[PDB]
Amino acid sequence: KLINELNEREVQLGVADKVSWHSEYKDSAWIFLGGLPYELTEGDIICVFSQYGEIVNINLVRDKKTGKSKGFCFLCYEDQRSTILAVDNFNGIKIKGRTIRVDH
Template sequence: MSVQKLNAVELQQGTAASASWHRDYADTNTVYVGNLPAELNEHDLLILFSQYGVPTAVRLARDPQTGRSKRFAFLTYEAWESTVLAVDNFDSWNVTPQHRLRVNHAYYKGRGGGSGAGDDEAARWERAVQAELLDKDFA
């Protein structure tokens, strides 16, 4: 069932916030963001998603050989309530006429301890993004 349908059912039934389907994800501050335009980068995501809270991490999936976006990301917020706002407001939102976002609660563990050159490059990229977060006072 889509996020909008779940929310509509809860509104119609007068479901209390403490009983909302969102509570099933109260132990994660991370959202999945899918169907992104290939041109969007981490900084764009931070700007867009900061409307609903303070992002503390963003991981845009990229092809290890080309560095091109795989058009999905995981974004972590400082507060769980921000994930609820992001899911409710960004799911099915048209970021462009051709790209309707898919946003939902997610669990993200990060990358395991790989040993390939691609892992090293990806780790450097993530450190650069974290430095950018700190430099821009997003974290």
């Protein structure tokens, strides 16, 4: 929720690109999707987030014993600009009634 208001202070003030805080990283593909719905699974979140790129490999944290999701996934794309696009875009999204969170 705090993200979207950082993108609004970044757009409103005329940040103009490379000083963007996605340049904070430059080293990292893997993204963090928290607040995910428990019914979701690999193939699903792959099908939704391959929109903005091609996701190479994602490890979704699912509790070892019960074998169900703890509610979040660390994902890895083939492209960084896909990550920048995904954090800056896909965030604040409704899924099954609950708004997911994303960040680097």
